[PDB]
Amino acid sequence: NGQTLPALKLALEYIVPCMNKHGICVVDDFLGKETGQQIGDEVRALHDTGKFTDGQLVSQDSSKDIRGDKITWIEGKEPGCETIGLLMSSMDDLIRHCNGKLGSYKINGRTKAMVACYPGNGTGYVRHVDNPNGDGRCVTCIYYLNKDWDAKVSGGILRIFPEGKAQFADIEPKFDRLLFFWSDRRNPHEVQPAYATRYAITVWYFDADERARAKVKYLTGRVEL
Numbered sequence: 553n554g555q556t557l558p559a560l561k562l563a564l565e566y567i568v569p570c571m572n573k574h575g576i577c578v579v580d581d582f583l584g585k586e587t588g589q590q591i592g593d594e595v596r597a598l599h600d601t602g603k604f605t606d607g608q609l610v611s612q613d614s615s616k617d618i619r620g621d622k623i624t625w626i627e628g629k630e631p632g633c634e635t636i637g638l639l640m641s642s643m644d645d646l647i648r649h650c651n652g653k654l655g656s657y658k659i660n661g662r663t664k665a666m667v668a669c670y671p672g673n674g675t676g677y678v679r680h681v682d683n684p685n686g687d688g689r690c691v692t693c694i695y696y697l698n699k700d701w702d703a704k705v706s707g708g709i710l711r712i713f714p715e716g717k718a719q720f721a722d723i724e725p726k727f728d729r730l731l732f733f734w735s736d737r738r739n740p741h742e743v744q745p746a747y748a749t750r751y752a753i754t755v756w757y758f759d760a761d762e763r764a765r766a767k768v769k770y771l772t773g774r775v776e777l
């Protein structure tokens with residue numbers, strides 16, 4: 553839970569040592585209240601104008617279906633997503649300044665942003681691993697936007713189950729909080745049921761080597777003969 557600061561200072565004095573020791577790192581006050589609020593306004597606008605999906609099918613008469621986390625993929629260049637793009641550029645700055653110091657990984661790319669909205673209907677996200685099968689993602693980066701979140705009332709804690717340790721790491725989805733954690737089986741995790749609207753923005757960073765050999769395993773095409 554570091555206190556945010558120049559991307560370099562954050563990276564060098566906190567993110568790198570913490571990731572190498574624990575594999576889970578939390579930075580509070582990452583962008584500040586004004587920018588964080590602008591991001592919140594953008595995400596809420598996406599929600600209000602219908603850009604999210606209807607939500608993960610949780611319970612399947614279709615009228616009674618229960619849906620959970622809603623998502624939209626954001627590049628950061630869309631009209632009205634400018635400050636999300638600024639967040640993504642800031643995440644990228646941090647990771648660049650971590651180059652070669654995050655384990656033995658060499659990060660050379662990332663996904664688009666996955667913006668998630670838990671609608672507050674008691675749904676969460678079941679325990680899972682982000683990259684269980686070697687798809688190239690080495691670091692999960694999540695930015696939370698929920699002002700005055702109170703988990704005692706609203707739920708929505710991200711619980712991580714660090715491998716080989718008999719303990720939970722419970723992360724409240726607090727406003728302006730940035731979370732990094734290794735994407736692989738070291739960090740299974742779940743979202744506890746959320747009883748208020750809960751937003752988060754996720755990017756995953758690729759390790760060059762794992763991603764290069766995933767491409768071979770994945771095999772999307774192909775050159776014609």
Ligand SMILES: O=C(O)CCC(=O)Nc1cc2ccccc2cn1
Nearest residue numbers: 668677682694710725741742743752
């Ligand atoms: O919001 C948070 O605290 C993170 C919750 C979480 O793990 N979300 C998540 C959402 C995903 C959506 C599509 C594919 C993989 C996914 C992996 N993880």
Ligand SMILES: [Mn+2]
Nearest residue numbers: 680681682741
């Ligand atoms: Mn996940």
